[PDB]
């Protein structure tokens, strides 16, 4: 019946990636909205698109991990 799945273009993957590594990865919703508008998606949509595009840059530049272990 009802899915509620769309699926990005080039033009969203062209400009959200422009706002990633030339401005910020933690934007606040102030710099968000623009995002949003500029190519055409919302803040709720811009969000997930930074966190999980996180998820890959973490691995890319290196970060520690949060795990408290007895032996590590």
């Given at each position: 019946?009802?899915?509620?799945?769309?699926?990005?273009?080039?033009?969203?993957?062209?400009?959200?990636?422009?706002?990633?590594?030339?401005?910020?990865?933690?934007?606040?919703?102030?710099?968000?909205?623009?995002?949003?508008?500029?190519?055409?998606?919302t803040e709720?949509?811009?969000?997930?698109?930074?966190?999980?595009?996180?998820?890959e840059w973490?691995?890319?530049?290196?970060?520690?991990?949060?795990?408290?272990?007895?032996?590590?």
């Open positions: 019946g009802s899915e509620g799945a769309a699926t990005m273009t080039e033009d969203q993957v062209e400009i959200l990636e422009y706002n990633f590594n030339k401005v910020n990865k933690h934007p606040d919703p102030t710099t968000l909205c623009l995002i949003a508008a500029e190519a055409g998606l709720e949509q811009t969000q997930k698109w930074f966190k999980q595009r996180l998820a973490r691995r890319s530049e290196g970060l520690p991990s949060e795990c408290r272990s007895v032996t590590d």
